[PDB]
Amino acid sequence: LELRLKSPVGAEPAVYPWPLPVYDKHHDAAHEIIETIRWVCEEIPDLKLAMENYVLIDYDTKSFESMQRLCDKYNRAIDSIHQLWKGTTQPMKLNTRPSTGLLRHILQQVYNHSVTDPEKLNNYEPFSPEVYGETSFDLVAQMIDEIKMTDDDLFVDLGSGVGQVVLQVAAATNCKHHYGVEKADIPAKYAETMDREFRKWMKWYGKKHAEYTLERGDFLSEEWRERIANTSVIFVNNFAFGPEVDHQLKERFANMKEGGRIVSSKPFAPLNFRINSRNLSDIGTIMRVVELSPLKGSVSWTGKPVSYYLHTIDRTILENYFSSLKNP
Numbered sequence: 001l002e003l004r005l006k007s008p009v010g011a012e013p014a015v016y017p018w019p020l021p022v023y024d025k026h027h028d029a030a031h032e033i034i035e036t037i038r039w040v041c042e043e044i045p046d047l048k049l050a051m052e053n054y055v056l057i058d059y060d061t062k063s064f065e066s067m068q069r070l071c072d073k074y075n076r077a078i079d080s081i082h083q084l085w086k087g088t089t090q091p092m093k094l095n096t097r098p099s100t101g102l103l104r105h106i107l108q109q110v111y112n113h114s115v116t117d118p119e120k121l122n123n124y125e126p127f128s129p130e131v132y133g134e135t136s137f138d139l140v141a142q143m144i145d146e147i148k149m150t151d152d153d154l155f156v157d158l159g160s161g162v163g164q165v166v167l168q169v170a171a172a173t174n175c176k177h178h179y180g181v182e183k184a185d186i187p188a189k190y191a192e193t194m195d196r197e198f199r200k201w202m203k204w205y206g207k208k209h210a211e212y213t214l215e216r217g218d219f220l221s222e223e224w225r226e227r228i229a230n231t232s233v234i235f236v237n238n239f240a241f242g243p244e245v246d247h248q249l250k251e252r253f254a255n256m257k258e259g260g261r262i263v264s265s266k267p268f269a270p271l272n273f274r275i276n277s278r279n280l281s282d283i284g285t286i287m288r289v290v291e292l293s294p295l296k297g298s299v300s301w302t303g304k305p306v307s308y309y310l311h312t313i314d315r316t317i318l319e320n321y322f323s324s325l326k327n328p
């Protein structure tokens, strides 16, 4: 026994066994199905136009028949749309990026099909750099909107977890490459499935994504010293990293090129940094730091609004200090 949803672009249908599984207290396969149909409707006007017909909510996530009736109405509409494209009508553009709303849904779907046992992610040594925590879709969305990127950029998420930040960025921008490196076995293992599921579902919806790679590794290693040096945009959720690891990261950001940028949950240099005779060796001498605007309604455990910081490699700061010394 099952449930099938045909792809709007001919990819292999999505098959859900019955009974539909539950992902967590607020997410189950039944709702995923309904939302997926809703979103494909957003991709295809004619499809949405056909789904209005009679579907007066007469479906209940409990009954197989009731769900099978929903899927079938969706599937029959997809067949007609497919015939419609054989006619004169223009077939949906295949190399487009997903809208933000579809992307949120897609990542939710990929996650649920990938992180089967969410609890396992918390099995980490507390009070260590291994502490797990996920950056909200919204913040990543904010970063993407504020930190403009181009096909010239190289994006890296240091300590990528199951890799959902990399996936969102790869789906939203056109960097030459996106990388995620994660050290712990658990999140890294899940990342392999996140990766497969993601590519599979993007194909299913007919949406394009930039190049990306999810890697198992240690970003403090020798290999990464240079890779970091060549990265133009680094995202790093270092809230629980600690002074030791942050110090080491600073030692590595010191080799980045001008205009290179770093977005993190904990600043690598004071915001009020004033270069003087005692702090010449400080990383703050070669970078501008600013606090990104907080997203309205966003309370972290600290009770205050969640905060992220943008650092921009700017050696002009240092150059001017020395000039100021040739005077005054």
Ligand SMILES: C[S@@+](CC[C@H](N)C(=O)[O-])C[C@H]1O[C@@H](n2cnc3c(N)ncnc32)[C@H](O)[C@@H]1O
Binding pocket: 129, 130, 131, 132, 133, 134, 135, 136, 157, 158, 159, 160, 161, 162, 165, 181, 182, 183, 184, 187, 217, 218, 219, 220, 237
């Ligand atoms: C807060 S989690 C990241 C969650 C995901 N990056 C996000 O933004 O939602 C931080 C990750 O850093 C990783 N990490 C810590 N030290 C690392 C190292 N030296 N090399 C690679 N990953 C490391 C951990 O294993 C942990 O999963």
